[model samples]
Target: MAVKLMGVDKIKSKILDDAKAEANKIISEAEAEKAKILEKAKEEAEKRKAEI
Candidate 1:
């Protein structure tokens, strides 16, 4: 077994950085999905306008 020593603040900072990265990734993915849904909505709206 090996134990590595790391400072408490360092560990907390690392965790915060990881959490921020994950949050940002999730937000970006959600924004992309939102854009796709909006585009789909517009497409259908256009179709309805054209009496499809």
Candidate 2:
């Protein structure tokens, strides 16, 4: 059996890159979900106004 290890700086650098990518992905999803929820709320508000 064999095992390999990376230096802490290398590991940290790799993790930072990975985290940055994931953060962008999450932000994109947040924006889409925000629009979706806002759209839903606007429709409800307009419909309620029409009822009044």
Candidate 3:
């Protein structure tokens, strides 16, 4: 019974670690995408101003 409990605890810990890593990856991707969008908007605004 003790061994089984220990194994289960290890699996739970691993799962938690994987989940945290995945969350961080998603957050980083979102930040990168936001930056790209903002940069594109700035470029478009500059182009419009230049045309004017």
Candidate 4:
């Protein structure tokens, strides 16, 4: 057990520290675009309804 320090400690650090934050940031940015697309889609739906 004493001769296996690297097998436990070295593999358990920062695995998701940067990637998880970056993924959340990217998702946050994409949410704005998602809302923009949803707004435009609803506008188109309204326009189609007006045409009918």
Candidate 5:
């Protein structure tokens, strides 16, 4: 006897969609925070340079 499975394709597509959405959300937030931090550091460096 043989067994068959159903909905395997739908399950795989759903998994892929969920993973992509999660990755995009994480990457976008990280990039925004990184830009903000770097900009602040640059401003601080410029201020110190002017003081010296």
Candidate 6:
């Protein structure tokens, strides 16, 4: 019986590196959207306070 081991470590390392980069970029985009929403909410709250 012959068992062959392929290039497993190298493949996993490359895949993990690319996946992490994508995750970081996604988080950055989400944070930017969160900031925009917060700013809009704050503006609306201030306007309502002035109206009252």
Cα lDDT of all candidates, in order? 0.83, 0.82, 0.84, 0.75, 0.80, 0.79
Most accurate candidate by lDDT: 3
lDDT of 2 by residue, 1-52 (tens): 2222646777777889899989988999999999998998789887777644
lDDT score, candidate 5: 0.80
Better candidate by lDDT, 1 or 4: 1
Candidate 4 or 2, higher lDDT: 2
Alpha carbon lDDT at 42, candidate 3: 82
| Alpha-carbon runs more than 4 Å astray in model 1 | 1-3, 7-10, 45-52
Ranking of all candidate structures by their TM-score, best first: 1, 3, 2, 5, 6, 4
lDDT by residue (tens digit), candidate 1, 1-52: 2323647677777889999999999999999999998999888888778645
Expressed as tens digits, the lDDT of each residue in 1-52 for candidate 5 is 2222576677787889889989998999988988987898788877768644
Clashes of each: 0, 0, 0, 0, 0, 0
* lDDT tens digits by residue: candidate 6, 16-42: 988998998899988898898789878
Screening candidate 6 with a backbone cut-off below 3 angstroms (N, C-alpha, C), the clashing residue pairs are none
What TM-score does candidate 6 get on C-alpha atoms? 0.47
Superior candidate under TM-score, 5 versus 6: 5
Residue 45 of candidate 2: its Cα lDDT?
85
Writing each residue's lDDT as its tens digit, candidate 4 over 1-52 gives 5645655544454556567778988998899889997899889988778644
Candidate 3 RMSD to the real structure: 5.0
For TM-score, candidate 3 versus 6, the one ahead is: 3
lDDT (0-100) at residue 10 of candidate 1?
70
Query: Per-residue alpha-carbon lDDT of model 3 for 1-52, expressed as tens digits?
Result: 5765669778887889899989999999989988998898788887777643
Which residue pairs in candidate 1 collide? Answer: none
Q: How well does model 3 score by local distance difference test?
A: 0.84
lDDT of 5 at 8: 68
